[PDB]
């Protein structure tokens, strides 16, 4: 045996042949709304994304399918070509992410401590997800707090990356947008506020007072303004703080407290990161 | 439930797996010949159009499929990708239109009266067909006497529009060609001769002697030389003569008599309308 | 009935659903390696070509499928779209050519005579293969000793043409490359060495001493430097030496002896023909 996995089985049937669709809205991505649906055999809950059919959508779906095999990428189970209001659309059925957002979960931790080791485990997971994409020459280009979601409500749920609506084949810089995004997420993970305000990005006391240079040097190599200066995903995953995530110190962070204190500005933080990512895309 | 309808199930099998094909010719459209065939389960008679496979054909078929749902558009039941003389072709199976042409049927009415109310019912049907196409941003661009056919030999048969071989997506004027065509059909419906000879388009006595300004104003807004002046299909369907077609006066027309008198020139009338439409397309 | 044959049934499933794949290598073509596999129902041996998925591959496969029906073209049985190392590839399953190369078989004849009539039968077979391709406006563009293979180890096995990795639709010179290739093969068939060295192409004594002008005139019309001077495949197949291949004289050739004597340079002969064909392609 040699370990081929199935190609894109894009289906022509009406989805209602195979899935019961609902009007429960689960989310909105940058291309459109995400709806709940139920598999007509199993009753298992799934999520449906409606994309109006187009060459851009046909490429993006194919990239998400190629991404699907990675344990930290949201899996596609089915894709349909259907007619809706007489205009042709694509319906992507994905696995149900009832676990919510990465940082919203941390902000909802309350009592218990959020450690540098847990930040290392999360950042290893995110980096491991990007590593698969870059190794097959796919760049995500919209890695951000809205797009990192958990599979279940338990503490040991597994984090998966979402919304390939900006993804791009690097075949002949686009890959550097993911590495910048990883540095921003890692910064927010370690103190609860972002490295931007609209005169440097600071490392303010007290939150950073005991934080190592080892992480801060790792941050400095990710947040370079020039894309050519940023470390690659390969170099990131080989850093000891990432590679040896079990051995990382259990250092308590301020992150949860600060995210609660700044909760009224958190929507703005996510919006200006989206604006920064859009600026790096219209490049 | 939400009312999705099935996407283009283009089939790879040999059509003879599914349909018995015959050598009975039913017609010729602008792209090619139309043949009789029989569904191998049901024995129901259908019509087969052979299009040599091409990107232009692949788009046009998709537009005809999107059009198919409208009650006044000829339905596609199946589409096949086959090999013929070693060169790849597309076979479109459509519903059987044994009812013949719109004006040929009127010309064959003989005895009984053809009324302005019946012209309003026909023009409502044609306008209702175009309205669906324009509302999904499809323009037909070849609406003409050859392309409006009836489902059955009875008087109350339903009229359907045919031959998407010039149709075009208006997505970024093409839509105005259908509105010009509707005005020409409406003119011929009301007197039996066209508004062209090769010094105005007339409204000659006696045939127009009792014909209202309400229709003639409606005609004047459709036959404008500049496309930007023509009424839209929306404005046409809202005209009282169209909207209130049951209330339209039962005025007897000269149409059938004139079509019989001018039958020797009717082929030329259809040919010069095709030439006028081709001129408006090479635009 | 009208004799449609099935279109390209390109399949989405994992090939291992349908075929047991092996690590036995059968060959390498210009695009990639050819592997042995077994049909999971029948156990019949087949050959698998892995092409990384691309528009160029999607066209070439379609051309090979259209070619497939000809008895002297290697048949495709199935085509799959699969994922491999997370990158999308195409797997072409072809009929098993255990019979080896055209000239390698002749070189391995040893004892028995190789006749001008047998050279006429081989050249009729090759010309008959090209005739199908040109009649559907496909040019092969890499007809050469590596690409002409036999279906079985018996003397009366049937010769088939292979490797459509350079084939091209002539739709608007490319067709002339096949005719040049046929002339080179015919030359080598008749004496055992090629008409090139890197000052004319000779007809040396003794091998050509009794060879007719009828073949040599046929050769002269195929090896013209200017493509516009070469005979077409139609004119070739109408030549009496080809058309009347059963009536061709049983003249004994030197070919097998010379191929054995020059066996140490035969790999170079095939390589410089490939280089000449590449030069005629980068045109
Ligand atoms: C109880 C419960 C059940 C399901 C969900 C849920 C929410 C959002 C998504 C989802 C599954 C897939 C995708 S995909 C996708 C999503 C989502 N959200 C919008 C953006 C991030 N873009 C995307 O592509 N399942 C939440 N809670
Ligand atoms: C008894 C009997 C049985 C069948 C028919 C019949 C004639 C023409 C067509 C048809 C069905 C589809 C299409 S399509 C199409 C057609 C036709 N005609 C040519 C032009 C208008 N273009 C087209 O695409 N069925 C007439 N009489
Ligand atoms: C016992 C035994 C069993 C099988 C074979 C065998 C060798 C080469 C090929 C083949 C089938 C298809 C194709 S295709 C293709 C091939 C081959 N060879 C490489 C080049 C010519 N290009 C091509 O496309 N079967 C030889 N011996
Ligand atoms: Cl997506
Ligand atoms: Cl059509
Ligand atoms: Cl090939």
Residue numbers in the entry:
A (entry chain X), B (entry chain X), C (entry chain X): 45 to 216, 240 to 265, 282 to 366
Text lifted from the article:
When doing so, it is important to avoid over-restraining to the reference model in the face of disagreement with the experimental data. Here, two new such potentials are described: a Cartesian distance restraint derived from a recent generalization of common loss functions and a periodic torsion restraint based on a renormalization of the von Mises distribution.
We performed a three-dimensional grid search over reasonable values of springConstant, angleRange and alpha using the following protocol, with three technical replicates for each combination of parameters. The resulting coordinates were then refined in phenix.refine (six refinement rounds of reciprocal-space xyz and individual B-factor refinement, using the starting coordinates as a reference model). To define ‘incorrect’ residues, we compared each model with our manually rebuilt and refined exemplar using a backbone and side-chain torsion scoring system that we defined for the assessment of CASP13 model predictions (Croll et al., 2019; for backbones the average of unit chord lengths arising from Δφ, Δψ and Δω; for side chains a weighted average of Δχ1 and Δχ2 chord lengths adjusted for the degree to which the side chain is buried). In each case an ‘incorrect’ residue was defined as one with a score higher than 0.15 (approximately equivalent to an average deviation of ±45° from the exemplar). Since R free is only poorly correlated with model quality in low-resolution models, optimization on this parameter alone is inadvisable.
